[PDB]
Design an enzyme around this catalytic site. Structure first.
Site, PDB file in Angstrom:
ATOM      1  CG  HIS A  60      -5.070   9.357   0.205  1.00 28.27           C
ATOM      2  ND1 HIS A  60      -3.751   9.464   0.095  1.00 28.27           N
ATOM      3  CD2 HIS A  60      -5.351   8.803   1.428  1.00 28.27           C
ATOM      4  CE1 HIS A  60      -3.189   9.002   1.182  1.00 28.27           C
ATOM      5  NE2 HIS A  60      -4.171   8.604   1.968  1.00 28.27           N
TER       6      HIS A  60
ATOM      7  CG  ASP B 227      -1.863   1.215   1.201  1.00 25.60           C
ATOM      8  OD1 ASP B 227      -2.801   1.195   0.400  1.00 25.60           O
ATOM      9  OD2 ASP B 227      -1.669   2.158   1.974  1.00 25.60           O
TER      10      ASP B 227
ATOM     11  CE1 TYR C 281      -0.132   7.709   3.377  1.00 25.56           C
ATOM     12  CE2 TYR C 281       0.455   5.501   2.600  1.00 25.56           C
ATOM     13  CZ  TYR C 281      -0.468   6.377   3.142  1.00 25.56           C
ATOM     14  OH  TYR C 281      -1.779   5.949   3.359  1.00 25.56           O
TER      15      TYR C 281
ATOM     16  CE  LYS D 277      -3.945   4.488   0.392  1.00 22.82           C
ATOM     17  NZ  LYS D 277      -2.527   4.507   0.759  1.00 22.82           N
TER      18      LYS D 277
END
Ligand SMILES: NC(=O)C1=CN([C@@H]2O[C@H](COP(=O)(O)OP(=O)(O)OC[C@H]3O[C@@H](n4cnc5c(N)ncnc54)[C@H](OP(=O)(O)O)[C@@H]3O)[C@@H](O)[C@H]2O)C=CC1
Ligand SMILES: O=C(O)Cc1nn(Cc2nc3cc(C(F)(F)F)ccc3s2)c(=O)c2ccccc12
Length: 315
Positions: A110, A43, A48, A77
């Site tokens: 997201h 994921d 991030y 995402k």
């Protein structure tokens, strides 16, 4: 089982490796250790800020012939500052080229609330108010459907959506590709019974995030709920000679829900996927389901009055 069948007939590995908070310095070797431990699902997310390194890991393991690309299930995402179509294409490209891949197996909206475009992930005025935007997730969905039609993404999904937001998407005029997943927080303190029943009733799978309570989340107050220390969960894990983290992951697997624990520690990455040699009884599953506290581990009070804030709906 070791996978959850999507509506497209693609099999999504049931245990994946979470990467939020994993530092750019450590995520490459953590993804390599996960692939060696049997993980076949990672994921990821543009937000991030470590997709480049995750890409380095995948590229190395495929170059070393440990696995082929098709053996893996990569998820990323679209952050809400990039719902506009021009920005959506630029963000997706950054995510795809950072991951150094030809395609993604699953791309997700997201969060449902569109935010002001720009460089920040959380644009804010001087009083700390997070700035929103009026471009919706339905507009962003059209740009995402194009990526599917271009052969760059196999399927689409949503994240942090309540059932009213999924209904709008499923009812969108001209919908070309349905959502195949709704990734939301889920663990024994936030069981999500109604949202999971609604998603399964529509053929939409559910991926549970923060399954261990996200102990490393920013600003976690040490006295808040601790799933890894709960004695009631430790007791059930002891009955099976397993750890609490293994019970917390097996819980989702027995509800046909994908789960994505995060770790940059090789021994834990291994421990988290050694959950296929035992089964929680029916009585143990009911007990764990009774631990619900409707508790979410990471909230942003500035998002409570937003138009698409998703948590105040019943489900
Ligand atoms: N779509 C969304 O809105 C969201 C998606 N997510 C996704 O879900 C993933 C997982 O959720 P996340 O919030 O990161 O938190 P998790 O619940 O997965 O917990 C991660 C923490 O648990 C620790 N840990 C992992 N395994 C063990 C173990 N066996 N024993 C003890 N400690 C352990 C890790 O330490 P260490 O790393 O040091 O080993 C880390 O501190 C995220 O990384 C992200 O991919 C998360 C939030 C939101
Ligand atoms: O995003 C991750 O995967 C992890 C994640 N979660 N959270 C909590 C959030 N709560 C939100 C609520 C809304 C809302 F839709 F409600 F407006 C919008 C956006 C967010 S971020 C964060 O604050 C965060 C910050 C940086 C990187 C990752 C995250």
């Amino acid at each position: 089982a070791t996978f959850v069948e999507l509506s497209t007939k693609a099999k999504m590995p049931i245990v994946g490796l979470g990467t939020w908070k994993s530092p750019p310095n450590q995520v490459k070797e953590a993804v390599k250790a996960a692939i060696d431990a049997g993980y076949r699902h990672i994921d990821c997310a543009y937000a991030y800020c470590n997709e480049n390194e995750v890409g380095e890991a995948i590229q190395e393991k495929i170059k070393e012939k440990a696995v082929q690309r098709e053996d893996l299930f990569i998820v990323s995402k679209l952050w809400p500052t990039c719902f506009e179509k021009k920005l959506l294409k630029e963000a997706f490209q950054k995510t795809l080229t950072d991951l150094k891949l030809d395609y993604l197996d699953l791309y997700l909206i997201h969060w449902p609330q569109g935010l002001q475009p720009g460089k920040e992930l959380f644009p804010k005025d001087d009083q700390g108010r997070i700035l929103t935007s009026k471009t919706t997730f339905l507009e962003a969905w059209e740009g995402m459907e194009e990526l599917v039609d271009q052969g760059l993404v196999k399927a689409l999904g949503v994240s942090n959506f309540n059932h009213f937001q999924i209904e709008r998407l499923l009812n969108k005029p001209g919908l070309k590709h349905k959502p195949v997943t709704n990734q939301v927080e889920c663990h024994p303190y936030l069981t999500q019974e109604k949202l999971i029943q609604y998603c399964h009733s529509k053929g939409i799978s559910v991926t549970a995030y923060s399954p261990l309570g996200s102990p490393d989340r920013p600003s976690a107050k040490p006295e808040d709920p601790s799933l890894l220390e709960d004695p009631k969960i430790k007791e059930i894990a002891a009955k099976h000679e397993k750890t609490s983290a293994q019970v917390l992951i097996r819980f989702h697997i027995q509800r046909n829900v994908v789960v994505i624990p995060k770790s940059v520690t090789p021994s834990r990455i291994q421990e988290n996927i050694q959950v296929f040699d035992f089964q929680l009884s029916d009585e143990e599953m009911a007990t764990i389901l009774s631990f619900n506290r409707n508790w979410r581990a990471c909230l942003l009070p500035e998002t409570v009055n937003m138009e698409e804030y998703p948590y105040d709906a019943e489900y």
